[PDB]
Each structure stands twice: as C-alpha cells, then as structure tokens.
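User: what does the whole thing look like in 3D?
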Amino acid sequence: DIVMTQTPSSLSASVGDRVTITCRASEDITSYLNWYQLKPGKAPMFLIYAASSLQSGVPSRFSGSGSGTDFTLTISSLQPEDFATYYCQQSYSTPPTFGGGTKVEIKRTVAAPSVFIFPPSDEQLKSGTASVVCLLNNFYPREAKVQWKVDNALQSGNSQESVTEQDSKDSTYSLSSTLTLSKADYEKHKVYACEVTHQGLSSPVTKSFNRG
Amino acid sequence: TITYQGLFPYQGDHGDMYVYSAGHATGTTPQKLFVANYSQDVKQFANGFV
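Assistant: Here's the predicted 3D structure for the full assembly of 262 residues, as structure tokens:
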C-alpha cells in the first residue's frame, strides 16, 4: 500500500509567519493528494484537492504545491484557525493513507514553569489509595520532562501525566502529574520529589515534600 | 430417440457463478489487480464438471 509521511510532525511558529509543510511519498502520486485541517472537537475540513486546486470556502493563504513523490502546503500568514493538525492523503491507490500530521502552537504567550507539590488528603489515606500531585503551571515549552524520585530512588510506570490544552492567554499548557504507591511502600517511603527538566529553564527544579 | 445413462448435470441446477473483472487502474496507468475470493474456495471433483 502507498505510504505518506509528513516531514514536520510538529513545529513552533508565531502569528503571521510563513509555514511550509512537506509530504513525502515512496511511489509517484502525479497529482493525487488531499489536504485536511483537523481541529480538536470538530471534523477535519478539506483544504486542497489534487494538491493543485484550492477547495471552495478555504482562504487564499492556504496553497497547494509540488508534484509526484513530494508535495508542499504553504500558508502565507499564520492565523488562530490555522493552528490545527494537517493531513496529506494519497488518492492514487485504492486504500487512501493519511499523513503523519502537523501540529502548530502559538508563540504569543510566554511563561516560566511553576512547580507545586500536594500531599494526599486524609480521605485518600483512609480509602487506602495515596496519590501525590506535582503541578506544573504556565510553562512556555510544549513538552516538559517529568521524573519522580523517592528516598533517592527513581520511580517509573507508577506516575501518570494529564495536560490541559493551551491557555491561549499565554499560549502555555498546564500539566498535573500524580504518583501512586502501595500503602506499605508509601508508608516506609519518606521524601517524595518531582524533578522537571526544561530546555528553557536554566536548572531542572526539584520540588519535594517529606512524608507527613 | 433412445434413453442413455451417463454423467450429466441435474435439471434446475443454477450452478456456481464466477465472473472475471478489470483490475484497478488510473486513466492511463494500470494499478492493483481486482479479483474475487475464488482462490480460497475449494470444491469436490467427484465426477468432473460442465
């Protein structure tokens, strides 16, 4: 089956910035590529048909370019609507295959990462499930590395990461990490530390609390 | 006019229908072949077929 790969899986661009997206095909697709814009909570919208003609009801800034194996989608100016997933699908073969996808995040809001640690409340202790919450708020980088160290020992697979969508006021995601331990293991464990590594931050910060 | 006994199909036999079809193709370029599931199907050659 034909395979379509999107060269930019993810990229960062500000408003009014020209963006070029490249779709790569193992086999020739003369003029058979369809571009779809996907925004979360709504269906994908047709942008270019055959990679040569703009779909009706689509802004002129979106452009279809390229032929055969390589096709290019160019947006003259970035817009809030423009910041959505982009898919390139081959129409040449009987089964169409969509592209890897393009993700855009606004660079209008700038924030410095803030870390908070919350101990489990009494009801969690009586229930028998103890969850410690490390809260990352207002962090400018799209991805933040999070590690859990307890009593100088790293913990892996007992933590989960839940991240809200971009605030758009500062264009920064908010991430909460919860670490779950068995009651016997949790009680013997003392200091619980969540350390986050950020390329933007000069030094990874450790926010910790003692058991009790 | 005489009556003869020989291998013959029974009357009212619809039989098995097989149709060959054109493969998937672009306007000027041939593409993937289009075929049915006949290869998987196997039938008993008890006395042969017409």
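In plain terms: Chain B has no helices and no strands. Chain B touches chain A through four residues (CB under 8 Å).
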